[PDB]
Enzyme design. Structure first.
Site, PDB file in Angstrom:
ATOM      1  N   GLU A 271       7.813  -3.998  -2.942  1.00 64.37           N
ATOM      2  CA  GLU A 271       7.203  -3.028  -2.007  1.00 64.37           C
ATOM      3  C   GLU A 271       6.514  -3.756  -0.876  1.00 64.37           C
ATOM      4  OE1 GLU A 271       6.853  -3.122  -5.458  1.00 64.37           O
ATOM      5  OE2 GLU A 271       4.970  -1.954  -5.662  1.00 64.37           O
ATOM      6  N   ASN A 272       6.168  -5.011  -1.114  1.00 66.75           N
ATOM      7  CA  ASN A 272       5.375  -5.779  -0.134  1.00 66.75           C
ATOM      8  C   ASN A 272       6.246  -6.815   0.580  1.00 66.75           C
ATOM      9  OD1 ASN A 272       2.416  -5.645  -2.263  1.00 66.75           O
ATOM     10  ND2 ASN A 272       3.075  -4.336  -0.582  1.00 66.75           N
TER      11      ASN A 272
ATOM     12  N   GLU B 232       3.205  -6.960  12.783  1.00 67.43           N
ATOM     13  CA  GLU B 232       4.629  -7.034  13.124  1.00 67.43           C
ATOM     14  C   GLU B 232       5.372  -5.825  12.568  1.00 67.43           C
ATOM     15  OE1 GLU B 232       6.480 -10.647  11.646  1.00 67.43           O
ATOM     16  OE2 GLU B 232       8.475 -10.153  12.438  1.00 67.43           O
ATOM     17  N   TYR B 233       6.266  -5.278  13.379  1.00 71.18           N
ATOM     18  CA  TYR B 233       7.162  -4.203  12.933  1.00 71.18           C
ATOM     19  C   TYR B 233       8.464  -4.807  12.423  1.00 71.18           C
ATOM     20  CZ  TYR B 233      10.619  -0.416  13.684  1.00 71.18           C
ATOM     21  OH  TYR B 233      11.648   0.497  13.591  1.00 71.18           O
ATOM     22  N   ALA B 234       8.752  -4.571  11.142  1.00 72.74           N
ATOM     23  CA  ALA B 234       9.961  -5.038  10.471  1.00 72.74           C
ATOM     24  C   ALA B 234      10.869  -3.825  10.311  1.00 72.74           C
ATOM     25  CB  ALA B 234       9.610  -5.619   9.095  1.00 72.74           C
TER      26      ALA B 234
ATOM     27  N   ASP C 256       0.465 -12.441  -6.907  1.00 69.45           N
ATOM     28  CA  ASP C 256       1.754 -11.832  -7.232  1.00 69.45           C
ATOM     29  C   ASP C 256       2.478 -11.278  -5.982  1.00 69.45           C
ATOM     30  OD1 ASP C 256      -0.456 -10.007  -7.381  1.00 69.45           O
ATOM     31  OD2 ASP C 256       0.905  -8.516  -8.281  1.00 69.45           O
TER      32      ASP C 256
ATOM     33  N   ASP D 224       2.425  -8.547   2.201  1.00 67.61           N
ATOM     34  CA  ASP D 224       1.104  -8.378   1.641  1.00 67.61           C
ATOM     35  C   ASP D 224       0.299  -9.617   2.046  1.00 67.61           C
ATOM     36  OD1 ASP D 224       0.813 -10.591   0.020  1.00 67.61           O
ATOM     37  OD2 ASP D 224       1.377  -9.532  -1.822  1.00 67.61           O
TER      38      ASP D 224
ATOM     39  N   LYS E  74      -2.388   2.711  -1.346  1.00 69.75           N
ATOM     40  CA  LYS E  74      -3.609   3.232  -1.947  1.00 69.75           C
ATOM     41  C   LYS E  74      -4.709   3.375  -0.896  1.00 69.75           C
ATOM     42  CE  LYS E  74      -6.840   2.599  -5.801  1.00 69.75           C
ATOM     43  NZ  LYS E  74      -7.090   1.882  -7.083  1.00 69.75           N
TER      44      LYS E  74
HETATM   45  C1  LIG Z   1      13.277   4.893   6.289  1.00 72.55           C
HETATM   46  O1  LIG Z   1      11.834   4.777   6.095  1.00 72.55           O
HETATM   47  C2  LIG Z   1      11.321   3.618   6.603  1.00 72.55           C
HETATM   48  C3  LIG Z   1      12.161   2.657   7.157  1.00 72.55           C
HETATM   49  C4  LIG Z   1      11.625   1.478   7.672  1.00 72.55           C
HETATM   50  C5  LIG Z   1      10.244   1.251   7.645  1.00 72.55           C
HETATM   51  C6  LIG Z   1       9.768   0.038   8.150  1.00 72.55           C
HETATM   52  N1  LIG Z   1       8.501  -0.364   8.128  1.00 72.55           N
HETATM   53  N2  LIG Z   1       8.267  -1.495   8.573  1.00 72.55           N
HETATM   54  C7  LIG Z   1       7.057  -2.089   8.709  1.00 72.55           C
HETATM   55  N3  LIG Z   1       6.849  -2.951   9.714  1.00 72.55           N
HETATM   56  N4  LIG Z   1       5.685  -3.390   9.686  1.00 72.55           N
HETATM   57  C8  LIG Z   1       5.009  -2.862   8.655  1.00 72.55           C
HETATM   58  C9  LIG Z   1       3.512  -3.211   8.332  1.00 72.55           C
HETATM   59  C10 LIG Z   1       5.850  -1.976   7.999  1.00 72.55           C
HETATM   60  C11 LIG Z   1       5.521  -1.188   6.711  1.00 72.55           C
HETATM   61  O2  LIG Z   1       4.495  -1.439   6.090  1.00 72.55           O
HETATM   62  N5  LIG Z   1       6.432  -0.298   6.293  1.00 72.55           N
HETATM   63  C12 LIG Z   1       6.371   0.418   5.150  1.00 72.55           C
HETATM   64  C13 LIG Z   1       5.207   0.518   4.368  1.00 72.55           C
HETATM   65  C14 LIG Z   1       5.247   1.248   3.159  1.00 72.55           C
HETATM   66  C15 LIG Z   1       6.447   1.834   2.743  1.00 72.55           C
HETATM   67  C16 LIG Z   1       7.625   1.723   3.491  1.00 72.55           C
HETATM   68  N6  LIG Z   1       8.760   2.348   3.063  1.00 72.55           N
HETATM   69  C17 LIG Z   1      10.047   2.060   3.367  1.00 72.55           C
HETATM   70  C18 LIG Z   1      11.084   3.000   2.740  1.00 72.55           C
HETATM   71  O3  LIG Z   1      10.452   1.131   4.066  1.00 72.55           O
HETATM   72  C19 LIG Z   1       7.565   1.012   4.693  1.00 72.55           C
HETATM   73  C20 LIG Z   1       9.403   2.215   7.075  1.00 72.55           C
HETATM   74  C21 LIG Z   1       9.937   3.406   6.562  1.00 72.55           C
END
Ligand SMILES: COc1ccc(/C=N/Nc2[nH]nc(C)c2C(=O)Nc2cccc(NC(C)=O)c2)cc1
Length: 261
Positions: free
Chosen positions: A135-136, A86-88, A131, A149, A18
């Site tokens: 998504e978080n 951090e990148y997850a 909560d 989150d 949002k």
């Molecule tokens: C295939 O599409 C995706 C695959 C992996 C990702 C991984 N994102 N990883 C993240 N590392 N650190 C942060 C902060 C995030 C993050 O917020 N990612 C995110 C946020 C909102 C939606 C999504 N969507 C998905 C599908 O993972 C990812 C994001 C998109």
């Protein structure tokens, strides 16, 4: 450190929410890969949430745990606020659920163990989660769960699906909120949707207040027992995280040790 936007090369959009867009990014000097969340000040101020974010960021800065997403830092310009995160790499649990439809008992109990470990660590330092939505929840390089989150408080919407009765009925809420959260997530992981899902906010409010849910046939007796223990209307009747971690369904199915400790 004094971070500015020119310190980073910005890559693909990871996601949108949002208030903010999240981008993959890399710090120029070190080549450190990370995620940059971009939030617009004017929007934060208009919604009355800029202070709430400030408080959540301060809480988050204290949390150091393999199952909690790390906040590296932050900065701002005239227009916006930038969170250095951090990148997850494996993305959201929400997306994994969509692709798999539902999780098996082993994945589910491993995830609940990881969450219970993270929440146990938070409770030990006077920190409580509101909560918790799929998504978080993000997944690290080895598939480890990360609570992403910043939804914390020392003591401080929206779709209602993950909120406990005491939060919607206008009651008092405590560390037992995140126990309810575990029950919702445990059910959603096994079934593929949360237990109080409904067509309207109004239908959901009532299902939550009444704790009105049923299990499909495939849900096992052990999972039913744990979920039924966590989804109690009265916060005081919900178990301790210790009890979750020692639950026989958790111990028989989890791939991860229940580091309470
Ligand atoms: C295939 O599409 C995706 C695959 C992996 C990702 C991984 N994102 N990883 C993240 N590392 N650190 C942060 C902060 C995030 C993050 O917020 N990612 C995110 C946020 C909102 C939606 C999504 N969507 C998905 C599908 O993972 C990812 C994001 C998109």
């Amino acid at each position: 450190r004094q971070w500015a936007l020119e310190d980073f090369e910005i890559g693909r959009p990871l996601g949108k929410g949002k208030f903010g867009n999240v981008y993959l990014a890399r710090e120029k000097q070190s080549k450190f890969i990370l995620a940059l969340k971009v939030l617009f000040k004017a929007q934060l101020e208009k919604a009355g949430v800029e202070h709430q974010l400030r408080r959540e960021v301060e809480i988050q800065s204290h949390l150091r745990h393999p199952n909690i997403l790390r906040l590296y830092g932050y900065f701002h310009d005239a227009t916006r606020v930038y969170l250095i995160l951090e990148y997850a790499p494996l993305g959201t649990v929400y997306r994994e659920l969509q692709k798999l439809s539902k999780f098996d008992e082993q994945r589910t109990a491993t995830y609940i163990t990881e969450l219970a470990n993270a929440l146990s660590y938070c409770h030990s330092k006077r920190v409580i989660h509101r909560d918790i939505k799929p998504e978080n929840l993000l997944l690290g390089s080895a598939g480890e769960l990360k609570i992403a989150d910043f939804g914390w408080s020392v003591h401080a919407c929206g779709t209602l699906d993950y909120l406990p009765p005491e939060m919607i009925e206008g009651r008092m809420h405590d560390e037992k909120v995140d126990l309810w959260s575990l029950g919702v997530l445990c059910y959603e992981f096994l079934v593929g949707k949360p237990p109080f899902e409904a067509n309207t906010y109004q239908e959901t409010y009532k299902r939550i207040s009444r704790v009105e849910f049923t299990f499909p046939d495939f849900v096992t007796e052990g999972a039913r027992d744990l979920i039924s223990r966590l989804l109690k209307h009265n916060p005081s009747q919900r178990p301790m995280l210790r009890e979750v971690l020692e639950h026989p369904w958790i111990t028989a199915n989890s791939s991860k040790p229940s580091n309470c400790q």
